[PDB]
Each structure stands twice: as structure tokens, then as C-alpha cells.
Amino acid sequence: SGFRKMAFPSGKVEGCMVQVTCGTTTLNGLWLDDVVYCPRHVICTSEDMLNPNYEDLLIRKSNHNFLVQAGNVQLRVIGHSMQNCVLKLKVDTANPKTPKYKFVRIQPGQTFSVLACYNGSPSGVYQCAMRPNFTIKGSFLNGSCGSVGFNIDYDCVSFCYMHHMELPTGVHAGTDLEGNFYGPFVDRQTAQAAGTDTTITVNVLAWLYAAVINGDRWFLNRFTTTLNDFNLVAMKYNYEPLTQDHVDILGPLSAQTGIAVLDMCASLKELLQNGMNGRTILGSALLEDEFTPFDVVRQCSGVTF
Amino acid sequence: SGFRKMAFPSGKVEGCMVQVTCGTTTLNGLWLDDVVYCPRHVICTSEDMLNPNYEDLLIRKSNHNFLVQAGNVQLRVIGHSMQNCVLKLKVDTANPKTPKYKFVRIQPGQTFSVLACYNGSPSGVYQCAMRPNFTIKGSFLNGSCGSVGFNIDYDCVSFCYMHHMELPTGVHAGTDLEGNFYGPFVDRQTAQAAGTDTTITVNVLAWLYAAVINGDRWFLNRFTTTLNDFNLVAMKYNYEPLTQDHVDILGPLSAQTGIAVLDMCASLKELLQNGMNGRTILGSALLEDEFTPFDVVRQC
Ligand SMILES: Cc1ccncc1NC(=O)Cc1cc(Cl)cc(O[C@H]2CC(=O)N2)c1
Ligand SMILES: Cc1ccncc1NC(=O)Cc1cc(Cl)cc(O[C@H]2CC(=O)N2)c1
Ligand SMILES: [Cl-]
Numbered sequence: 001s002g003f004r005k006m007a008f009p010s011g012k013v014e015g016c017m018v019q020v021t022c023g024t025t026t027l028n029g030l031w032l033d034d035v036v037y038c039p040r041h042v043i044c045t046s047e048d049m050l051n052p053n054y055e056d057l058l059i060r061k062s063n064h065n066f067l068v069q070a071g072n073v074q075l076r077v078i079g080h081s082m083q084n085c086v087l088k089l090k091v092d093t094a095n096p097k098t099p100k101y102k103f104v105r106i107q108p109g110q111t112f113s114v115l116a117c118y119n120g121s122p123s124g125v126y127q128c129a130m131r132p133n134f135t136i137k138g139s140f141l142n143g144s145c146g147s148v149g150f151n152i153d154y155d156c157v158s159f160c161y162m163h164h165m166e167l168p169t170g171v172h173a174g175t176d177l178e179g180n181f182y183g184p185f186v187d188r189q190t191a192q193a194a195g196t197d198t199t200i201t202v203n204v205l206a207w208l209y210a211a212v213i214n215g216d217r218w219f220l221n222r223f224t225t226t227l228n229d230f231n232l233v234a235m236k237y238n239y240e241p242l243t244q245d246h247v248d249i250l251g252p253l254s255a256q257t258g259i260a261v262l263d264m265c266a267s268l269k270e271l272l273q274n275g276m277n278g279r280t281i282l283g284s285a286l287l288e289d290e291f292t293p294f295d296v297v298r299q300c301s302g303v304t305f
Numbered sequence: 306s307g308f309r310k311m312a313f314p315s316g317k318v319e320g321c322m323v324q325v326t327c328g329t330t331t332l333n334g335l336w337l338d339d340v341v342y343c344p345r346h347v348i349c350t351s352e353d354m355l356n357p358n359y360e361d362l363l364i365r366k367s368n369h370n371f372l373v374q375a376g377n378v379q380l381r382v383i384g385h386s387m388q389n390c391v392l393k394l395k396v397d398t399a400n401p402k403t404p405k406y407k408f409v410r411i412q413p414g415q416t417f418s419v420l421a422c423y424n425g426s427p428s429g430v431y432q433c434a435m436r437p438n439f440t441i442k443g444s445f446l447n448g449s450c451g452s453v454g455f456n457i458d459y460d461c462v463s464f465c466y467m468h469h470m471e472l473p474t475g476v477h478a479g480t481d482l483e484g485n486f487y488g489p490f491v492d493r494q495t496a497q498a499a500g501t502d503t504t505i506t507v508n509v510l511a512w513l514y515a516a517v518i519n520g521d522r523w524f525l526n527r528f529t530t531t532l533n534d535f536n537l538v539a540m541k542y543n544y545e546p547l548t549q550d551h552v553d554i555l556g557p558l559s560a561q562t563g564i565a566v567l568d569m570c571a572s573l574k575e576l577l578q579n580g581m582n583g584r585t586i587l588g589s590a591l592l593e594d595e596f597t598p599f600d601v602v603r604q605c
Contacts, residue, residue, distance in 0.1 A: 001444075001445070001446075001471055001475030001476075002442055002443045002444035002445060002475060002476075002477070003444055004429075004431035004432075004433075004443065004444040005310060005431065006421070006429035006430065006431045006444060007312060007429065007430050007431070008429065008430075009315045009316075009319050009420065009427040009428075009429065009430055010314045010315050010316055010430065011314075011315060011316030011317075011319040011320065011427075012316075014314050014316035015316065115314060116311070122314035122316070123314070124311035124312060124313060124314065124604070125311065125312050125313070125314050125315065125430055126309040126310065126311045126312065128309070137307060137309075137588065138307050138309065139306075139307040139308055139309035139311060139604060140306070140307060141306075166306055166307075170306035170307055170519065170520070171307070172307065214475070215475070280591070283442070283591075284590075284591065285589075285590035285591045286585070286589070286590045298428075298429075299429065299444060300446075301446075302421075302423045302428050302446045302448065302449070303428060304422070304423050304424065304426035304427060304428045305426065305427060305428070
């Protein structure tokens with residue numbers, strides 16, 4: 001019993017974190033095999049950030065301009081190249097702690113664990129979701145750039161996020177490990193704002209199933225709804241549309257609890273139109289949308305890594 | 306910016322998790338140096354769980370009755386002893402992954418990270434607080450016993466909790482790493498109930514300071530309060546009394562934000578009276594009490 005916002009065990013990722021310094025800027029790097037990945041903005045001064053020409057800034061750098069520190073050992077940089085918004089520093093040593101890994105680009109609503117780092121040292125781990133507006137509501141300070149997001153699928157770490165910046169609203173933006181930004185953001189010190197966010201409907205339903213599994217049923221009702229009527233209500237409340245794929249994905253949770261997906265949608269519609277009436281669900285007075293259906297199944301069944 | 310429930314990176318603890326089997330029972334163990342720590346109830350059968358006599362059950366076991374598996378390697382048990390409710394299995398190999406560590410017994414309101422495990426394998430990491438009623442609101446299933454709670458301030462892991470059982474309300478009870486239970490609980494399947502839980506007042510104040518540090522001030526007011534008047538009000542909402550120790554602990558956060566502790570207490574009194582009126586504080590519609598003053602300073 002119990003339901004917590006749970007991150008993946010971070011050990012496999014901790015063994016990959018290094019410190020990258022270029023001039024006065026120090027941030028985090030991810031060392032996998034003989035390459036260290038980090039935000040390309042490590043090469044910028046404050047003035048360069050206003051309007052950087054990264055190819056021009058990079059051509060002026062030599063290998064010895066990048067200091068990479070893994071623990072208390074300095075790694076030798078023997079090459080450097082840029083892929084989109086990520087800098088790749090070739091090092092003379094393959095990371096002996098390199099886990100089985102892959103780089104995956106996730107979709108909005110998908111969750112992942114973030115290993116927040118400063119100076120190449122992991123400080124904390126938290127679970128979060130890629131918002132529909134492509135930001136993450138992370139917890140990051142200056143020096144956290146290069147911190148990564150990941151999932152574990154069996155014994156393989158799938159790296160999906162690298163931290164680059166904080167927007168004026170306090171939310172965060174970054175890229176996949178191929179350097180492609182999530183969202184309409186650019187790596188430049190310039191006026192940028194996140195689009196209006198929406199709630200991840202399939203995740204709220206997953207969390208309502210988790211609440212039922214944990215003995216919280218007050219919100220259930222005798223009603224059902226069509227997918228189209230539910231989507232009309234979802235649009236009204238700034239909830240993401242629910243597709244048939246979402247319903248299919250909620251199939252196992254629906255079969256385990258005996259609450260059809262459209263039956264749970266009728267509970268969600270009533271919750272949206274009426275509120276919770278002073279009550280809570282899993283210790284929350286708001287509808288939680290940062291647990292996917294897979295996260296709920298994983299936590300309620302004790303899957304290990 | 307941002308404020309999350311943040312756990313410590315679990316790597317240092319993952320390298321210590323092992324599987325311990327005694328007969329038909331399998332649970333988790335914590336392998337540090339040449340000793341594996343685990344709940345002593347691993348030696349119980351179904352028939353032993355209401356009134357086990359652990360000294361009697363343990364005297365009947367030989368070293369080879371305990372199977373310890375670290376990854377895909379079986380560790381040889383060369384000794385065994387019981388310390389309170391923890392069993393200590395001496396093994397023939399020191400854990401090469403043993404981090405710098407210590408055992409610390411925590412007080413209610415203290416937070417820690419839990420590395421939930423099954424069959425010696427880590428499943429997930431989350432953040433917990435030791436409730437005022439000495440239980441923890443964890444996420445644990447059958448097989449999670451022996452999973453541990455810890456803090457890693459600097460590079461030293463301070464182990465503070467070892468999971469032993471789930472009470473009928475769904476909350477969890479366990480011991481420190483010296484085997485002493487937190488709370489009035491016993492490792493027996495006899496009827497046990499947690500005392501009425503209360504909100505950790507000092508932690509709610511810490512989190513209100515975190516909200517101010519992160520730019521939110523809507524809940525502030527022009528009022529102050531005496532410590533005694535605050536406690537008289539707060540107790541009516543099942544909040545823990547705020548002591549002068551707590552007021553002192555909030556000193557740095559008070560000095561950083563410019564809001565006196567009793568001034569923040571008046572905000573809390575008003576929030577308890579009015580609720581949030583459709584507003585949120587750090588993305589929450591309820592008052593959060595699982596961040597300590599130390600956690601707020603570390604994260605913000
Ligand atoms: C200080 C901090 C805190 C947390 N996480 C990260 C950081 N660091 C930064 O944001 C530094 C930075 C890097 C880039 Cl590529 C762009 C940038 O300005 C953009 C952000 C916006 O809206 N204009 C600023
Ligand atoms: C099933 C489960 C789920 C999560 N975490 C742990 C578990 N396992 C247990 O609770 C097993 C267990 C061990 C002990 Cl030492 C005592 C016990 O019964 C006490 C609890 C109560 O009210 N009487 C029960
Ligand atoms: Cl609501």
C-alpha cells in the first residue's frame with residue numbers, strides 16, 4: 001500500500017556524471033563510452049548568449065579548452081563536435097561504468113527521472129513529466145545545466161532529457177540527447193515563454209486507477225460516457241484530448257479494478273465540473289497528472305532494475 | 306527555481322542491496338563491509354508470526370540456513386547475531402561497493418529517501434518523512450521488507466530506517482539500523498494501530514518559506530502571533546506544537562526572506578482558517594509537511 005512519486009534508481013546514471021568546464025563556465029556532462037555530452041552553451045560567455053553563433057564560437061576552441069573531471073580524475077579531451085544543441089567531447093578513456101543505454105526522444109505526457117547535478121556531482125533525483133507545452137516543472141539552480149532525465153526499461157537506461165535552461169516562469173527547457181529541444185525553445189539568452197499548459201488526461205486517469213487500487217473509491221459513480229462527450233468536456237477544462245490509444249493503454253488497469261476506461265472518464269468529468277468537495281485522492285486536493293499508466297502498473301506490481 | 310520532492314541519488318545504497326532467504330521467506334538485506342543487515346522476522350514461518358520467540362527461533366538456525374544473494378553471486382554466511390529487531394549476518398566477503406556510511410536514529414518530522422526493493426533489486430526511490438505517530442507513508446508491497454531509508458548529506462550515507470511491516474491503515478513501520486523500532490510497534494502480526502497522526506508544523510513553515518524564496522507571497526498577511534496563541538490555533542487543526550527549538554531552526558529562512566517566524570505562523574493560522582481559495586503554493590492545493598527546514602535550504 002501507499003503511492004509515491006517514485007523515480008528510477010539513479011545509480012546507473014550517477015556513474016556517468018562528470019563536470020565540464022570551458023573558461024569560466026562550469027556545468028555537467030554525461031560520459032558514455034568515450035564521449036562526454038553537454039549543452040553547447042558551455043562555450044558561451046554572457047555576451048555570446050545574447051546572440052550566439054555556436055559554429056563560430058566552437059571553431060575558436062581547442063581540446064585543452066575543455067576541462068572534463070570525472071570524480072577527482074581529469075579526462076583528456078581528444079576531439080569535439082556539435083550535434084544540434086549538444087556538444088560532444090571525445091575523451092581518451094571509455095567510461096568503465098557505462099551502462100547498457102539508448103537515446104530516446106519522449107512525447108509530452110511521458111514521465112522520467114531527473115538526476116539533478118552540480119559540478120558533476122549528483123545532488124538529488126526526482127520524477128517529472130514532459131508537459132504538453134514541452135517544458136518540465138523541474139527543480140534546478142545555476143550550475144544544473146547538463147543534468148539528465150532518463151527511464152530504465154529492463155536493464156537499459158534510456159536517456160531522454162538534458163537540461164539547458166530556465167524560463168522566466170521558473171519552469172525548465174532542454175533537449176533530447178541528440179540535442180533537439182523539446183518545445184519551441186532556443187539556447188539563447190532572449191525573451192522566451194512557455195505556451196499555455198494543459199493537463200495530461202491519460203495520466204490523471206492512471207492515477208485515479210492507482211487511487212482505486214489503494215482503496216480510495218469515493219469519486220466512482222454509476223455513469224459512463226462516450227469518448228467524444230468526454231473530449232468535449234476535456235477541451236473545456238484545458239485537458240489534453242483522450243485518444244483510443246490512451247483507452248487501450250488503460251486496458252490492464254481497467255481490467256484489474258473493474259472500472260471501464262469510459263466509466264473512469266465519467267468520474268473525471270464529474271470531478272472537473274464539481275471539484276472534490278473538500279475531499280482528497282491519494283493525499284492530493286488536485287488531480288495528479290505526472291504518473292503514466294505504465295508508472296502506475298510498475299509501482300503497484302513492484303518491478304525491479 | 307522550482308521546488309520538488311527530491312530524493313537523494315540512490316546509487317550508493319543500490320550497491321548495498323542483497324536478497325536474504327531463510328527457508329521459504331525471502332526479503333532484502335543491506336550489505337555493508339562484511340555484514341548483511343535485515344529484519345529478524347526473515348527467520349519466521351507463517352505459524353511463528355503472532356508471538357515469535359526470536360531467540361528460540363534463531364538458536365535453531367545454522368549459518369547455511371541463510372542464503373544471501375548479491376546480484377547473481379551467493380555470499381557465504383559465516384556468522385549470525387541479532388541486535389534488537391535486526392538480524393546481522395556475517396559474510397565471508399566485504400562489499401567492495403560499501404560507501405562511507407553511518408547509522409543515525411531520526412526524530413519525527415525528519416525526512417529521508419527510501420530505496421524500495423524486492424528480491425534484493427531496487428525498484429524505485431522516493432522521499433518520506435517520519436510521521437509524528439512514528440509511521441511512514443511509504444509505497445511498499447509484500448517482499449519490500451529490509452528496504453532502507455537514508456540521507457546522503459555530503460558523500461556519507463546515513464542509514465536511518467529499515468522497513469519491517471505495514472499496519473492496517475496502509476502506513477509503514479520499521480526500525481533504525483540498530484533494530485530499535487520507531488514508535489510503539491513490535492515485529493509480531495498481533496493487532497497494531499498507529500496513533501492519530503498530526504501535521505509537522507515546522508516543516509509546513511519551512512515549505513511556506515520555500516514558497517516565498519520561489520517568489521510567492523499571496524498568503525502573507527500584516528499579522529504576527531505569540532507562540533502560545535499559534536499553538537492553541539494549530540492544535541485545533543491537528544498540527545504538532547511548534548516549540549522554541551522549531552522557531553530557532555527557522556531562523557536562517559526567516560533572515561533570508563525577511564519574514565519573522567511568528568509572522569509566518571500568522572500566515573499559517575490564516576491558511577488553516579481560509580484554505581487556499583483556488584490558489585496553489587508551490588504547485589500544491591494542500592499544505593506540504595514533508596520538507597524540513599534543512600531540505601528547503603539545501604534545495605532552494
Ligand atoms: C540559472 C538557471 C537555473 C536553472 N536551470 C538553468 C539555469 N541556467 C540558465 O537558464 C542559463 C540560460 C541558458 C540558456 Cl541556453 C538560455 C538562457 O536564457 C533563456 C532562458 C529564457 O527564457 N531565456 C539562460
Ligand atoms: C504486506 C506488506 C506490505 C508492505 N510492507 C510490508 C509488508 N509485510 C508485512 O507487513 C509483514 C508483517 C511483518 C511484521 Cl514484523 C508484522 C506484521 O504484522 C503487524 C503489522 C500489524 O498491524 N501487525 C506484518
Ligand atoms: Cl479539481
